[PDB]
Amino acid sequence: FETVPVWRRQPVRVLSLFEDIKKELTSLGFLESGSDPGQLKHVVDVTDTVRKDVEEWGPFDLVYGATPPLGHTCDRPPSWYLFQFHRLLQYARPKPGSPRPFFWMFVDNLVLNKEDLDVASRFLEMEPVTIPDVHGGSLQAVRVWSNIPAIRSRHWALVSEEELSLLAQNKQPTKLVKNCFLPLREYFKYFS
Amino acid sequence: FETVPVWRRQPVRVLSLFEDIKKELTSLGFLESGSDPGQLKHVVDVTDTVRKDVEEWGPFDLVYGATPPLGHTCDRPPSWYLFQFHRLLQYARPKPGSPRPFFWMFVDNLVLNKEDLDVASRFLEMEPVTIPAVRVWSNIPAIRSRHWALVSEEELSLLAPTKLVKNCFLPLREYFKYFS
Amino acid sequence: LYPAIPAARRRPIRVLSLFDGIATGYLVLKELGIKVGKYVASEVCEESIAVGTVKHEGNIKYVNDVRNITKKNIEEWGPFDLVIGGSPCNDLSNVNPARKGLYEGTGRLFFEFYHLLNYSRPKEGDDRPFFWMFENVVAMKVGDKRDISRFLECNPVMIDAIKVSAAHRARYFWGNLPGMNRPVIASKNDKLELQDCLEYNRIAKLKKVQTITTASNSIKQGKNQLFPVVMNGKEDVLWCTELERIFGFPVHYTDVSNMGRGARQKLLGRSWSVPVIRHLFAPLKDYFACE
Amino acid sequence: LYPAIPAARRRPIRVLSLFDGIATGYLVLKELGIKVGKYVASEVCEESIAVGTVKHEGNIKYVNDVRNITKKNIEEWGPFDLVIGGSPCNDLSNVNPARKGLYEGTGRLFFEFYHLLNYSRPKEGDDRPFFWMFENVVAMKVGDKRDISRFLECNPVMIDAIKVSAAHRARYFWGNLPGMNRPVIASKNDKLELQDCLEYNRIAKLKKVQTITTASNSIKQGKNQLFPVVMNGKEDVLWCTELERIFGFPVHYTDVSNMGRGARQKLLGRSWSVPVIRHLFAPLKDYFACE
DNA sequence: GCATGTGTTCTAATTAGAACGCATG
DNA sequence: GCATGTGTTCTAATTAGAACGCATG
Ligand SMILES: Nc1ncnc2c1ncn2[C@@H]1O[C@H](CSCC[C@H](N)C(=O)O)[C@@H](O)[C@H]1O
Ligand SMILES: Nc1ncnc2c1ncn2[C@@H]1O[C@H](CSCC[C@H](N)C(=O)O)[C@@H](O)[C@H]1O
Ligand SMILES: [Mg+2]
Ligand SMILES: [Mg+2]
């Protein structure tokens, strides 16, 4: 995906699932403060959404997947979020002749175990990249799979899993959103 | 087997296996005293005896079988005596046409297990009669014919041949020469 | 429907079979007169592989565990004209009270079939013929049958083996095979009642037997657990060769690998009813070579 | 010795088989093309009788334990043109150090064959044809081989299956069959090497195997006690179907009565080598009807 | 001059058979 | 109204593997 000149960058058409990130996308400056309809669709109870639905919702430039943050909001099994995400992702890809850049990403608030991790990487054809966001200490970490080049291009601070295992319980995102959503307006319109 | 007139009762011809009964038999007068070659043949061990042997030993009128009585040691299994006995009788029995009366008897000293009793009866085609003691299987009509005292198995528990044993030989005199 | 292929343009079929079991798919296809170009089987049970190896003399390429099959593998071993699979129902069937649903335990192996089916689908702009089919139990949670249908973008037709075999076996069938909803009709060589499956000097106490599972308890019939057979006046259970006839397999099909009664039943209890798979695959004769 | 019969005066054969086992006698007779009029089998093992009835569809009349056969029975079920049998050798063979000779234990069952053979013989002056045969192991005490020969009034002809089987099997054969002493020669269909008896994708380490017994240890060859087979690079024991092909039996002949590996090996281990029995019964088709 | 065999026994796993379970035509 | 099922687990019987044995080419 070659970069696009600045005078040819459209606004993103974002599909967001299981978690609403409109507050974050508008903030980093990809969405209009006021949209008559909107450039971002958001659904949660996806069990009953068909391919004909996401096609009727216009084409999409980005599809964003997320698991709920560490808490007691686990009403469905952990694997359920990825499988449904992969199901909709294939509904949302454009025709084989790519008119424009089409990106996707799926994030995990450390809710998937080992067995759920290796099945996630097999389906997304990529093994994840994790972010520390721990400039203060061991403070508040999320694994992301992503199409976005700069997400899987620049390597930042590493961390041992023996230390990543203990910090999972530590809960009992200004920097995180900035870290990887950032290198997307080298492809889309920047609003501010 | 019908009875025979007295003037044509020839002398017996006995095959005795596992016991020399010549002494016991002559007593009741069936064998002429002294060097009578064709009156009794005795074989103690038979494991190598072929049919051609007992045929060459002349025809027989009586075949006698017995086991070792209260022997201190028997070098052979108990069933061995019956099996070798049945084997030779088939050799000794004459042609299907009956020239004369042919008899046989087997005698057990209460040395056969109950497992050996039921195979003894099956092979000799009859259940044994007990003479009070010793059990005998026999072709002779007059030892499976008449009087015999009925004793029970509780008598064989505590048990664990001049007059009593010879009482099962007397009916053979009605068929052969009485030597006196 | 799919465009008909003229009898001469037809070419041998190339099949990707996942959770192949005892190679029922291959067996049906060759008993159907279809020339099999390639049969790629994913199976991990050593006894199951042993059967498909010995009974089919190595025409089946075994590919161990389905979860180690890559996108590269599908293009290498491809192309595929048929993709068939029956996922394990240890955690889906209602016969198990402790079942863990579609998303935990063994049930999530369904998604491997979904995953590898799309790797195998022809790319857009290539309407070469392509058929698939997925099977599972009817006795599953409503949420599972719903979600399975959503991923396959299809709704199942149910076929019960009882119309063509001597046994109750009600199973769902997602797919795109020609005439799946077609009315099921028996053949003149289907052993329709249990007496037709027994060997000499055995009497059938029923005309049709309840659903056979892996456990030996589904051979005793009903809530009075009577042995389904009488032999020489004594009650007796079914025999391994008799279980085979019930399922439509060739007799002695599982006489492999020193397997005893329990082992054969575990393999047969998990399989497909042969005459039902024969029903489904029958319209494929008009799309592939026949020799 | 016995004069030939013209083809039209030949009647079907009537055979009394004692210790019938798995009906090897009937099998070889039918495989020779001989019309079998009557086959009266004395056998007391349940699954052995199961095999005979199922594989031969009730043509064999089973007459339980041999010690309950009467003189009356022989003349009712008779007449017989052939009397065959092999007594239990667990108390005669050298492979058991706790043998009890042929006068105690199960060895006494030989005399049952002797005793029922005399009943079956045609009475003096009946020059009709009559054949008998008796088999046992060579590894018996010399005193036993002597006594058996005395009662049968005959001397045994040892035949080893090694020349027609893929297995060492040396056994004595008393009898009066035509040409027993003749040299044995193989046939086209005889599977002479172990590799001819194995299944697909299995490799045999030897050309011949040591004598098969009932125990599963007889299958590990030599002092090294190694698995006679390799498949998929791993060592493995023989399979029940392979054990069958070794003995010359039809494959799946013991897939009966839900029998596992051990059960089937117990029956095959005490059996006769089919091609040896065929060699012995082959001259009989010149005395009896053929269909 | 060492190896082999129509089996038994003993011990140690490997079963076999049934209880368990309840949503649903 | 109530019987049924592509299975698990528990517990009881039953069964695998090899040591054992030594006469005899
Ligand atoms: N991870 C895996 N990869 C491939 N096969 C697997 C697997 N896990 C389980 N299986 C196999 O999938 C099969 C499902 S049972 C279905 C058997 C088959 N439909 C037939 O006709 O017999 C089982 O045999 C099981 O051994
Ligand atoms: N008392 C008895 N009456 C009849 N058969 C008996 C018996 N005792 C043992 N047997 C049987 O005699 C057989 C001897 S093994 C010989 C088997 C046979 N020759 C074959 O080719 O297979 C065994 O199957 C055993 O079950
Ligand atoms: Mg359909
Ligand atoms: Mg001879």
Author numbering:
A (entry chain B): 179 to 318, 320 to 351, 360 to 379
B (entry chain C): 179 to 310, 320 to 347, 360 to 379
C (entry chain A), D (entry chain D): 563 to 853
What does the report in the manuscript say about this coordinate set?
Mammalian DNA methylation patterns are mainly generated by two de novo DNA methyltransferases, DNMT3A and DNMT3B5. The catalytically inactive DNMT3-like protein (DNMT3L) has an important regulatory role in this process by acting as cofactor of DNMT3A or DNMT3B6–8. In addition to CpG methylation, DNMT3A and DNMT3B introduce non-CpG methylation (mainly CpA) in oocytes, embryonic stem (ES) cells, and neural cells. For simplification, we choose the DNMT3B–CGA complex for structural analysis, unless indicated otherwise. Similar to the DNMT3A–DNMT3L complexes, the DNMT3B–DNMT3L–DNA complex reveals a linear heterotetrameric arrangement of DNMT3L–DNMT3B–DNMT3B–DNMT3L.
To further determine the role of DNMT3B K777 in DNA recognition, we generated the K777A-mutated DNMT3B–DNMT3L tetramer in complex with the CGT DNA and determined its structure at 2.95 Å resolution. The K777A structure aligns well with that of the WT DNMT3B–CGT complex, but exhibits a subtle conformational change along the G6-T7 step: in comparison with the WT DNMT3B–CGT complex, the T7 base in the K777A DNMT3B–CGT complex undergoes a slide movement toward the major groove, further reducing the groove depth around the +1 site. Consequently, the G6-T7 step appears to engage a stronger base-stacking interaction in the K777A DNMT3B–CGT complex than in the WT DNMT3B–CGT complex. It is worth mentioning that the hydrogen bond between DNMT3B N779 and the CpG site is unaltered by the K777A mutation. WT DNMT3B shows a ~2-fold preference for CGA DNA over CGT DNA; in contrast, the K777A mutant shows increased methylation for both CGT and CGA DNA, but with preference for CGT over CGA, which likely arises from the altered base-stacking interaction between the +1 base and the CpG guanine. Likewise, our NGS analysis reveals that the pronounced preference of DNMT3B for non-CpG methylation at sites flanked by G at the +1 site was completely lost in K777A, which instead showed a preference for T at this site in both CpG and non-CpG context. Similar to the in vitro analysis, the K777A mutation led to a G-to-T preference change at the +1 flanking site in all sequence contexts, relative to WT DNMT3B. Nevertheless, the N779A mutation led to a modest decrease in the CpG specificity in vitro and in cells, in line with its role in CpG recognition. These findings establish that K777 of DNMT3B functions as a crucial determinant sensing different sequence contexts flanking the methylation site, which is distinctive from what was observed for DNMT3A.
